[PDB]
Amino acid sequence: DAFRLIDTGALINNLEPRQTTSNTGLLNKANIQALIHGLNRHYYSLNIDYHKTAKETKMLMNLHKEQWQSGLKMYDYEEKEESNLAATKSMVKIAEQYSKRIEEEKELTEEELKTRYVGRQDPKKHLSETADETLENNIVSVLTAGVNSVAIK
Amino acid sequence: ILDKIFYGVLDQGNGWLYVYETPNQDATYDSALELVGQLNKVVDQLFEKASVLY
Amino acid sequence: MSLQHEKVTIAPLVLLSALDHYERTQTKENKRCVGVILGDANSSTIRVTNSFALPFEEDEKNSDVWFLDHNYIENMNEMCKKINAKEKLIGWYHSGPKLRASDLKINELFKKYTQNNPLLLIVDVKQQGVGLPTDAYVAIEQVKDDGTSTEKTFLHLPCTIEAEEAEEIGVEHLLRDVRDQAAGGLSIRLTNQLKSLKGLQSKLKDVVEYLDKVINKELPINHTILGKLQDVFNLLPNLGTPDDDEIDVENHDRINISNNLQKALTVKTNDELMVIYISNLVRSIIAFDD
Amino acid sequence: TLEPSTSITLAERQQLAYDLSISALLGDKIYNFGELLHHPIMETIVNDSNYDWLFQLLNALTVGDFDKFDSLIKVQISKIPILAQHESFLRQKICLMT
Numbered sequence: 001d002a003f004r005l006i007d008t009g010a011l012i013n014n015l016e017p018r019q020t021t022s023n024t025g026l027l028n029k030a031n032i033q034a035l036i037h038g039l040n041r042h043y044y045s046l047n048i049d050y051h052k053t054a055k056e057t058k059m060l061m062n063l064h065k066e067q068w069q070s071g072l073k074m075y076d077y078e079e080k081e082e083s084n085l086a087a088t089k090s091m092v093k094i095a096e097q098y099s100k101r102i103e104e105e106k107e108l109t110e111e112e113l114k115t116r117y118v119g120r121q122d123p124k125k126h127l128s129e130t131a132d133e134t135l136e137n138n139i140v141s142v143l144t145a146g147v148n149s150v151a152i153k
Numbered sequence: 154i155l156d157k158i159f160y161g162v163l164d165q166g167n168g169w170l171y172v173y174e175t176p177n178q179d180a181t182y183d184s185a186l187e188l189v190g191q192l193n194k195v196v197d198q199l200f201e202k203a204s205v206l207y
Numbered sequence: 208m209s210l211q212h213e214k215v216t217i218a219p220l221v222l223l224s225a226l227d228h229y230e231r232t233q234t235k236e237n238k239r240c241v242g243v244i245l246g247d248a249n250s251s252t253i254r255v256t257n258s259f260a261l262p263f264e265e266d267e268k269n270s271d272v273w274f275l276d277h278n279y280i281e282n283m284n285e286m287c288k289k290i291n292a293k294e295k296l297i298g299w300y301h302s303g304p305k306l307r308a309s310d311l312k313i314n315e316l317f318k319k320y321t322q323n324n325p326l327l328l329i330v331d332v333k334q335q336g337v338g339l340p341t342d343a344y345v346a347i348e349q350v351k352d353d354g355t356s357t358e359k360t361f362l363h364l365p366c367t368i369e370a371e372e373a374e375e376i377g378v379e380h381l382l383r384d385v386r387d388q389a390a391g392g393l394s395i396r397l398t399n400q401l402k403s404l405k406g407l408q409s410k411l412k413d414v415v416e417y418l419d420k421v422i423n424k425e426l427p428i429n430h431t432i433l434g435k436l437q438d439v440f441n442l443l444p445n446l447g448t449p450d451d452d453e454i455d456v457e458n459h460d461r462i463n464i465s466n467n468l469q470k471a472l473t474v475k476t477n478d479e480l481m482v483i484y485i486s487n488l489v490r491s492i493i494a495f496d497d
Numbered sequence: 498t499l500e501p502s503t504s505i506t507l508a509e510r511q512q513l514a515y516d517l518s519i520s521a522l523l524g525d526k527i528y529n530f531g532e533l534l535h536h537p538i539m540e541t542i543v544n545d546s547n548y549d550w551l552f553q554l555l556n557a558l559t560v561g562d563f564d565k566f567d568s569l570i571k572v573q574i575s576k577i578p579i580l581a582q583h584e585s586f587l588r589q590k591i592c593l594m595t
Contacts, residue, residue: 188467202481202485206481206484206488
C-alpha cells in the first residue's frame with residue numbers, strides 16, 4: 001500500500017477534499033481504530049496498479065524448454081496404479097454414506113431434513129466430484145500411452 | 154493344494170508337479186465389485202422417490 | 208578452475224532486469240549489452256540472484272574491438288555487498304541474439320574477478336522461441352581427439368528457472384493468465400499433448416537436415432553430436448515384446464476404471480432428473496392457488 | 498596436445514606410431530582402429546614398407562575379414578615375438594569386434 005502525507009496545516013485549511021477530486025472514489029483500508037485513524041485523517045492513500053509491456057509478459061509466461069514438451073513425459077505405472085486403486089476404494093465409503101442420506105429426508109422443511117439425515121456435509125456432491133476428477137485423469141493417461149508406443153517405434 | 158499351502162496343480166497324465174505362487178487377484182477388480190454393488194442398492198432407493206411421478 | 212555449473216537456476220527478476228537495461232542504453236542494430244551477474248557459487252546449482260549493467264561499447268567495424276570499464280566493476284560490487292553479502296561475481300550476461308567467438312576473450316577477462324568458472328548467460332532480448340529465452344554456457348578448456356590442442360570453447364548448460372517464495376508470488380500478483388503450455392484441465396492437457404508431440408517433430412527435422420550438411424556441405428564432424436544419437440537408437444523402445452503385451456493389459460485396467468466411473472455419474476444425474484420433476488408437481492399446486 | 502615448435506622429432510614419432518599399432522592389435526579393449534588411421538601421424542606415414550603390414554593387421558580387424566587376418570598373422574607372428582606371447586589376445590580380438 002502507498003501513502004503520502006497531508007500536512008497538519010493542510011488539515012486546518014481543510015484541503016482534504018481537494019486531494020480526492022477527479023478520482024473513482026475507491027480507496028483502501030487496513031485494520032480498524034488505530035490503523036484507520038492514521039490512514040484517512042493524517043495521510044492520503046491511492047491504489048496501486050501494475051505496468052508491463054508485451055515483451056515482459058512473454059518473459060514471465062515462458063517456462064522450461066521441456067514444459068511445452070511435458071505431455072510426452074509419462075509417469076511410472078506404479079504411481080498410476082496407486083491412483084486407480086485409491087479412487088475406487090474411497091468411493092465405496094462415500095457411497096455407503098450416500099445410502100443413509102436418502103433413506104429418510106422426505107418430510108417437510110428441507111434444511112431440517114438436511115441437518116437430520118446427513119445432507120449437510122453433502123456426500124452426493126462429494127461422490128460426483130471424486131468420480132469426475134479421476135475420470136479426466138485417466139482419459140489422458142490412456143492417450144499418452146497410445147501415443148508413445150506407436151510414435152516412437 | 155486344497156489347504157493352499159502352495160496351491161499348485163498336479164498333472165497326473167505326466168506325473169509332473171507345477172507349483173503356482175502367482176497372484177490371480179487384483180485390488181481394483183475386487184473393490185469394483187463392491188462399488189457397483191453400492192449403486193444397485195442406491196438405484197432401488199431412487200426408484201421409490203420416483204413413484205410419486207408415476 | 209572447476210565445473211560446478213551442472214544446473215543454473217535463474218531468478219525471473221534478472222530476465223526482466225536485462226530487458227530494462229538493454230533499452231535504457233538503447234543498444235539496437237546489433238549493439239550489445241553486458242552487465243555483471245551477482246549471486247552464489249560453489250553449489251552445483253548456480254543461483255542467479257541479481258544483475259547490474261556495466262558500461263560497455265561494442266564496435267561495428269569488428270567484433271574484436273570493444274570498450275569495457277574495469278574500474279567500474281569493483282564499485283558496483285562493493286555497494287551491492289552492503290545490501291547483501293552473499294553476492295559475488297559469477298559471470299556476465301551477453302544480450303546478443305546468439306553466441307559469438309569474441310565472447311571467449313571477454314570470458315577470460317572476467318575470470319580474473321571470479322573464484323568460479325565464468326558463466327556466460329546469453330539473455331535473449333528478442334524473446335525467440337516458445338521455450339526459454341535463455342541458453343547458458345561456460346568457457347572450459349579441452350583437448351580433443353581430432354588433433355586439436357588446448358581449445359577454449361563453450362559447452363551448453365541446461366537452463367532452468369527457480370524463484371524465491373517472495374519472488375514467485377510477485378509474478379502471480381502481476382499476472383493472471385492461464386498459459387498455453389499449462390497442464391490443467393482436460394481441454395488444457397489435450398492441447399499440451401498435441402503441442403508436445405509437434406515440439407519433438409520440429410527438433411528431429413533439424414537433425415536430419417543437419418546430417419546432410421556434414422556430408423555434402425562440410426560442416427564439422429564432432430563425436431559429442433554423433434554419440435548422443437547413438438544413445439537414442441540403443442535405448443529405443445520395442446513393441447511386440449512381452450513389455451508391449453503388459454502395456455495393453457495395463458491399458459485395459461485404466462479403460463476399466465473409466466468405464467466404472469462413467470456409470471457412477473449416470474446414477475447421480477438421474478437422481479437430479481427425478482427431483483426436477485417432483486419439484487414441478489409441487490409448483491403446479493402453487494400455481495393453481497396463485 | 499603436440500607443440501607447434503617441434504621438440505618431438507619425426508624419428509621419435511615413427512616409433513611411437515609403431516608402438517600404438519602394437520598396443521591396439523594385442524590389447525583387449527581397443528576398438529578405435531580407424532581413429533589412428535585418421536590421425537595425421539599415420540595419414541602421412543603409410544608409405545614406408547615397415548608401415549604397410551602393421552596397419553594391414555589393424556584394418557583386418559576393422560572390416561572383420563578372417564581371410565586377410567589369418568594370412569598376415571602367419572608371416573608376422575614368426576617375425577615378432579610380441580605378437581607370439583600375446584597370441585591369444587590377438588586371436589580373440591577379431592571375433593569380439595565382429
